[PDB]
UniProtKB/Swiss-Prot annotation, chains A, B, C:
Gene name for this UniProt entry: RAD51
Name the record gives this protein: DNA repair protein RAD51 homolog 1
Disease: Breast cancer: A common malignancy originating from breast epithelial tissue. Breast neoplasms can be distinguished by their histologic pattern. Invasive ductal carcinoma is by far the most common type. Breast cancer is etiologically and genetically heterogeneous. Important genetic factors have been indicated by familial occurrence and bilateral involvement. Mutations at more than one locus can be involved in different families or even in the same case.
UniProt modification remark: Ubiquitinated by the SCF(FBH1) E3 ubiquitin ligase complex, regulating RAD51 subcellular location and preventing its association with DNA. Ubiquitinated by RFWD3 in response to DNA damage: ubiquitination leads to degradation by the proteasome, promoting homologous recombination. Phosphorylation of Thr-289 by CHEK1 may enhance association with chromatin at sites of DNA damage and promote DNA repair by homologous recombination. Phosphorylation by ABL1 inhibits function.
Matches recorded under SUPFAM superfamilies: P-loop containing nucleoside triphosphate hydrolases, Rad51 N-terminal domain-like
Residue stretches making up the HhH domain: 28-57
Organism in which the protein naturally occurs: Homo sapiens (Human)
Keywords attached to this entry: Acetylation, ATP-binding, Chromosome, Cytoplasm, Cytoskeleton, Disease variant, DNA damage, DNA recombination, DNA repair, DNA-binding, Fanconi anemia, Isopeptide bond, Mitochondrion, Nucleotide-binding, Nucleus, Phosphoprotein, Ubl conjugation
Binding site for ATP: G107, E108, F109, R110, T111, G112, K113, T114
Length: 319, 319, 319
DNA sequence: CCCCCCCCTATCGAATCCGTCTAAAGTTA
DNA sequence: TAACTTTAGACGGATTCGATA
């Protein structure tokens, strides 16, 4: 795991400076080593000499140089993937949701995004040999659609206990964009004490549709969204967790020659499109069956799979 | 290749001055000869007389005068071009990616920038008669989307061995703009010992969108980006490698100007527009096919070509 | 042609003073006659009495008095103009590029500055009755985008010999502002022996953007630019060559008053604005067609024209 | 041949683009 | 017992420094 920030104290830094860094938002040596000088300067009690000394001391404990592709391949071969509860989706994703990156799921209503989030929140607590991540879960809720009964129903299927499954989920509700960004600092503070395997934001872009209204507020909205996504990436790199965000759709009214993937576009613009690593397009099939399509990925071919929303969570279609 | 800076000691320079120069970031005689006097002055242990003597000796060791266009033509006729793995793109570029200059590829998401980067990283190790550059590769990664399995697939396509292909790639991950600029000094130090042929930065402008937010920081952002591009150009000139960078896009919301010409504009502004030599525009086609268009070039006419992203890298569309 | 500085020996000047002046950078009687006293004083081996004697002899050898406007009209009616390869541009400029003055072309990327420079470099060698200048071309390259194949294409278009066209062009690459200024002394040295007709600097302000960074270095940058422009003007006056330089653009990010048309401004400021005699503004049209506009001139009305970039250089739009 | 002091002046020189949103409407035995 | 097409508007935003005889 990451090294606590207290190591800098014996590395040769004043305890007051470490305290100031702690209230700034940094809680590990890695978080300090990943920040630019201008971010540390903004702290009231930090001067240029203090900043460069802190950066030089932090750079010794964290490797930030060159390496080979063989070492990276060996390190990545030991990464953890979390099963989704459906064999078809697992085969489509070649194992399940990866850790250390950002995954995004978008689609129209009743397509099964909250259901997948609930199933993953339950599943991330299984032992590794059974397909789990063996950790706790964090659930930042934006719309107000969190239902623990679905968690209990999913936990019943895998033969776990309901009480300690509900004990391992942390829930928070965000009421505006400022609160949504503020919750991430407390999330970073919490992750040093225990071990977390998953962090869920649902929905990521729901409040930006209303907080910033017209074309006159577009640039500020995009800048705020970019800052939020950068913080999410920093958390994923620092703690090695899996981040799953949820998006919405918008219509195309120009009536031009676009008939593939329907006149549906995910909201957020180019910012969220470039930031995300994997994008999944969710569509409705027949009855309780849905269709999942690989929309964007650096290593996964474009394909399709079929799953269903059963009484015990997300599972294969019963035919 | 370039001359090591140790020759200045024989030319009559104190070894301590050479050590100071190496600590500053100059590892070859060419890097010293190309630097202005005010850059050498900034070093703590160098005076005006020492700078003048060093510059005089370096100029004595490097040809920096007038020549004839016939000699330039003869020298350029022996340049090395690296194939992209697609016949259509090779015909469009009249041979492939050209060393000694900066090439930029931009477009929206899943258009194929990272796939082309992986294919080039594998291909730059082929023998010259087979379309390669016969050298190692350097991959500075910004977003966290490096996947060695794609490298293994592309290597399997060409019949090479996976192990040494992975051994011949150097990987580094940048976490901020300062770290991204800092990695170039280590790259310059590395390139003296072994022969390289390609250097990928992907993405080159991803961290600038978030490190500097508003209009109040535009000037500093542009200055930092200009300095980074100048360092890249100096590396390309000194070592004769091919530099390939990757860019993103921004929307035009001003109104009903222009026409339906895909109102997407690359980011970076006039600095990156003027600095780049060749610019490639990537567009999404149908299925797995993509379209590449020549956006800017001093010797290549505007045209288009089609390629596909197959299971073994970038190649021609199978129709 | 100008009188070589060796003529002063017959006027009562020691060879020591003559070679000291030559080492200083003076190679003709006109150069000495136009220089102020303090410039001669700055030379180590020249005292005040020697400087006064040299100035008196030079003023004897060179006419520096009052004349009438009819004589000026008669001498100006014999001026030489070089065609640009396009009939409409020649009509706009009323003959072509004038010798003895400084012309500046600016615009954004792929607007056709380098193509025009290549076309002019080939064209300046045609016979006078064909629209040429009957001389050699000097090309000072700053960015590294010199391609002799375009020269070969234009020479093939005009039915010349490619070998001779390539042989009659002198090429030099500049790496910093100091080198850019230092190359002018060698240019002045070479212009004495052979008859040159064109001097191209492309780009003139590319290195000034990165060599001097912020507002703290504005004054030194502007003074260096002013000295460079003054030396260019001295060369144009002394040898009667045509001086064509290239500029870049910068965005305007405030004050939407009379600026909604085009928020593009050339760089360099009032120094280059006042120094330049004629300024041309290039725009992007449709396809391969571009638009040229008169931005500043002492004798030409403000108008517009249209040209195109073809496979054989700059020509007329094929409609 | 002898023994002690006086006083400021004058401005220069521009840079740097960003960021998408919004579905509607039945018809003809 | 089936096959059928058109439609248009909308805006705001901020900061930067050195140079002498
Ligand atoms: N216990 C259950 N058994 C079966 N299906 C259920 C159960 N609970 C919910 N569903 C299904 O969940 C579907 C809605 O999925 P979900 O709540 O994930 O929507 P969503 O994609 O998040 O939508 P929105 O954009 O409105 O938030 C419904 O169509 C319903 O059939
Ligand atoms: N093994 C594979 N087989 C087929 N297609 C693949 C494979 N791996 C990736 N792809 C394709 O690669 C595409 C994404 O391309 P790429 O990763 O180069 O995007 P990009 O241009 O770098 O985007 P971004 O701006 O998100 O970084 C996907 O659409 C996917 O279909
Ligand atoms: N052989 C050719 N045939 C047709 N067009 C060509 C040919 N070679 C180059 N071009 C055109 O030249 C254009 C670029 O022109 P040029 O190199 O003069 O640009 P520029 O304004 O000098 O740019 P920069 O600011 O980057 O230096 C491209 O848009 C390309 O279409
Ligand atoms: Ca992406
Ligand atoms: Ca360019
Ligand atoms: Ca003028
Ligand atoms: Mg939901
Ligand atoms: Mg990518
Ligand atoms: Mg050019």
């Amino acid at each position: 795991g990451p090294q606590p920030i207290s190591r800098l104290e014996q590395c040769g830094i004043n305890a007051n400076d470490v305290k100031k860094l702690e209230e700034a938002g940094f809680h590990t040596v890695e978080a300090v080593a990943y920040a630019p000088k201008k971010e540390l300067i903004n702290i009231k009690g930090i001067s240029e000499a203090k900043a460069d000394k802190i950066l030089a001391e932090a750079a010794k404990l964290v490797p930030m140089g060159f390496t080979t592709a063989t070492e990276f391949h060996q390190r990545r071969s030991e990464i953890i993937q979390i099963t989704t509860g459906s064999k078809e989706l697992d085969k489509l994703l070649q194992g399940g949701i990866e850790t250390g990156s950002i995954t995004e799921m978008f689609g129209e209503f009743r397509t099964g995004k909250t259901q997948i989030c609930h199933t993953l929140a339950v599943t991330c607590q299984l032992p590794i040999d059974r397909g789990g991540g063996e950790g706790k879960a964090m659930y930042i809720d934006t719309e107000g659609t969190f239902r623990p009964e679905r968690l209990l129903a999913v936990a019943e299927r895998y033969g776990l206990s309901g009480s300690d499954v509900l004990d391992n989920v942390a829930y928070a509700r965000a009421f505006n964009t400022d609160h949504q960004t503020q919750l991430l600092y407390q999330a970073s503070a919490m992750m040093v004490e225990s071990r977390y395997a998953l962090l869920i934001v649902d929905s990521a872009t729901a409040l930006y549709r209303t907080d910033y209204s017209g074309r006159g507020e577009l640039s500020a909205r995009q800048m705020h969204l970019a800052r939020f996504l950068r913080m999410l990436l920093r958390l994923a790199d620092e703690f090695g967790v899996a981040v799953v965000i949820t998006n919405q759709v918008v219509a195309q009214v120009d009536g031009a020659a676009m008939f593939a993937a329907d006149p549906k576009k995910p909201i957020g613009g180019n910012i969220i499109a470039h930031a995300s690593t994997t994008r999944l397009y969710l569509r409705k099939g027949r009855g309780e069956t849905r269709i999942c399509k690989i929309y964007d990925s650096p290593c996964l071919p474009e394909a399709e799979a079929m799953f269903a929303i059963n009484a015990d969570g997300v599972g294969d279609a019963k035919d």
